[PDB]
Design a protein around this ligand. Sequence first.
Ligand code: YBP
Length: 462
Amino acid sequence: MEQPEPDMITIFIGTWNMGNAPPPKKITSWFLSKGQGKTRDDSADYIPHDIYVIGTQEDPLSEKEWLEILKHSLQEITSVTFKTVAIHTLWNIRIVVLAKPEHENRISHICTDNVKTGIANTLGNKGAVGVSFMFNGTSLGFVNSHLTSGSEKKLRRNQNYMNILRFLALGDKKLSPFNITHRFTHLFWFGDLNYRVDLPTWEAETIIQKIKQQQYADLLSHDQLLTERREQKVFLHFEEEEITFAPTYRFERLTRDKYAYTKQKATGMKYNLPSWCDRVLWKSYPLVHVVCQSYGSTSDIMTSDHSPVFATFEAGVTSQFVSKNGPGTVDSQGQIEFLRCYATLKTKSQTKFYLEFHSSCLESFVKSQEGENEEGSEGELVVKFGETLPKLKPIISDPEYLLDQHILISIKSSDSDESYGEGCIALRLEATETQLPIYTPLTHHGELTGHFQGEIKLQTSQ
Ligand SMILES: *CCC(=O)Nc1ccc2cccc(Cl)c2n1
């Protein structure tokens, strides 16, 4: 009588800087996506999300204490006893992953890790925790980061981001050229990112007035995370839902009627103008379904100087496919061919380069011959592969499997074997047996290093 495997799941993401205070007795509004912003319909209150991922900062509770509160809260809402997938804490930064009991046998390869940011003085409370796992055929990653505080420290926040994405060891370790920004079908990155509204301190009361009027436009135009992202300084190739809720920091505790922005000994004589510190971003592989269903803040949880933030997503997932052939052999009906491909690189290096193709649809990664270096008009390096690239042999040829897969590409130096650029190509093509354009930007350490473009021709069993 087996339940069919899902094609889509819903995921709840929560971030809350708890301000080193215990929570109030009731926090269900958080998990219901109720308050300000893009909120969830009342008619969905009893429908459980498939996965709940809860990130805290300045969390004063034990793992045991917080798990008990979380599981009781979800049982009250849904009448379901959720299973603990993973819990990991670095200092007072914590991530909890809970899942419906029906998903226990769909989840495998659970990993946790942390990154400590800063050196000496700036090492010891900021960094990130994360969790990854497989959900049937779909790889999921989750990062909760508490970045450097202070309105004048946006560059340090951007440096913290680059250290976390380089050093957090999640996902398939065989994907050696790839950082967490390429290892997952869906990656969610959330936390107290600590970016501020960059307006003069003497405009504090003006800002509060704007908030009371629910007029966020002239504040969001100065939000450091939106401006740094627009300038490609941080979170390149991530998405965020439009913000339609009030700044979530810095509140007087025990009400939400008052923003506490003035400099005090307790703040290091820093101002904390109202800001959207608490954020949820994501990055999914090309042409995979991901839709943000909610993004908002609670109004009734007041123990911290931050309000909790929620976001919910409908995310596409795939099945664990088994044919008569693969896994454990190739299906010769299938092939992936790359035609007239070239990489354009920002590097000044004059080494030869080769490609590596990594995918779950291959028995193991494939290494190309070296390309032929030319100079582009505007000074650049162009690495030409012609029709020289290997024919990739997928393990399963069924189009219902193969059209849902992705090929990770690394371009590596022949001299050093180091990646100069990583990217991802979807096989969700408009046509099979047809030459079609392909394209990915290439990044390294999450910054743009080039592009890969050319044509693909996909052979399936149909
Ligand atoms: C966390 C260490 C590790 O290697 N995890 C791992 C291994 C294999 C995987 C396959 C597919 C998806 C994921 Cl998330 C995997 N993670």
